[PDB]
Amino acid sequence: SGIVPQLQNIVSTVNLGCKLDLKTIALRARNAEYNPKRFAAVIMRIREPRTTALIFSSGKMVCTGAKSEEQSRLAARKYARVVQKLGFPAKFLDFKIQNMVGSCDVKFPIRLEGLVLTHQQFSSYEPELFPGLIYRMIKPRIVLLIFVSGKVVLTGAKVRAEIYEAFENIYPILKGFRK
DNA sequence: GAAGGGGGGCTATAAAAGGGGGTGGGGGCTCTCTTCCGCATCGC
């Protein structure tokens, strides 16, 4: 195909293995914001990795915004150290990547009306609700947002192989509905 | 001050986290016959 999707966002969850005091973290953490009325977690941001992480009292933390697997793990470790630097016994346990978001362009307009007809079992095109066709691939459990402009967004992948594999499967299908 | 324009939020997509709140599902017309009541009567 000659086109490789580029990851736009990765969601990874890591357990620190120790209960944390959310109020204490907000007071001392540099960028943390805690609003129990709004959300029950502590939202923190670190610019150099350019990622955002949510910290819960149970010790589990979710890291989002990383553009690569290495960045997500590095960003998650940095957040854990910040909590550890606050006097808590934070660790890096069962780090896992929960979601990978990738985007790409096929460089040609797509006839979404034709695509849904031939793939009604997997496609879902509702212009009233969303201007982009939602494709649910089965062999890889990846949900693809195909747009008339040609932009394709892949999400729900656990590994980078699924993102590339999913695009390889849909690209020939899109080529058959080129506008 | 009406109208077009610009910027931005909303919509859906996945996923994790944890808890509050929303939602749904149990539980403390005429004639005839029968029955009841008041009365006067005797009885003891």
UniProtKB/Swiss-Prot annotation:
Expression sites (tissue/organ): Widely expressed, with levels highest in the testis and ovary.
GO biological process: DNA-templated transcription initiation; mRNA transcription by RNA polymerase II; positive regulation of transcription initiation by RNA polymerase II; RNA polymerase II preinitiation complex assembly; spermatogenesis; transcription by RNA polymerase II; transcription by RNA polymerase III; transcription initiation at RNA polymerase II promoter
GO cellular component, one term: protein-containing complex
Residue positions binding DNA: N9, R45, K60, N99, R136
Keyword S-adenosyl-L-methionine: no
GO molecular function list: aryl hydrocarbon receptor binding; core promoter sequence-specific DNA binding; DNA-binding transcription factor binding; enzyme binding; RNA polymerase I core promoter sequence-specific DNA binding; RNA polymerase II cis-regulatory region sequence-specific DNA binding; RNA polymerase II core promoter sequence-specific DNA binding; RNA polymerase II general transcription initiation factor activity
Keywords for the protein's UniProt record, in alphabetical order: Disease variant, DNA-binding, Host-virus interaction, Neurodegeneration, Nucleus, Repeat, Spinocerebellar ataxia, Transcription, Transcription regulation
Function statement: The TFIID basal transcription factor complex plays a major role in the initiation of RNA polymerase II (Pol II)-dependent transcription. TFIID recognizes and binds promoters with or without a TATA box via its subunit TBP, a TATA-box-binding protein, and promotes assembly of the pre-initiation complex (PIC). The TFIID complex consists of TBP and TBP-associated factors (TAFs), including TAF1, TAF2, TAF3, TAF4, TAF5, TAF6, TAF7, TAF8, TAF9, TAF10, TAF11, TAF12 and TAF13. The TFIID complex structure can be divided into 3 modules TFIID-A, TFIID-B, and TFIID-C.
Record-stated family: Belongs to the TBP family.
Oligomer and partners: Binds DNA as monomer. Component of the TFIID basal transcription factor complex, composed of TATA-box-binding protein TBP, and a number of TBP-associated factors (TAFs), including TAF1, TAF2, TAF3, TAF4, TAF5, TAF6, TAF7, TAF8, TAF9, TAF10, TAF11, TAF12 and TAF13. Part of a TFIID-containing RNA polymerase II pre-initiation complex that is composed of TBP and at least GTF2A1, GTF2A2, GTF2E1, GTF2E2, GTF2F1, GTF2H2, GTF2H3, GTF2H4, GTF2H5, GTF2B, TCEA1, ERCC2, ERCC3, TAF1, TAF2, TAF3, TAF4, TAF5, TAF6, TAF7, TAF8, TAF9, TAF10, TAF11, TAF12 and TAF13. (Microbial infection) Interacts with HIV-1 Tat.
Stated name of the protein: TATA-box-binding protein
Gene from which the chain derives: TBP
Residues of the full protein shown: 159 to 337 of 339
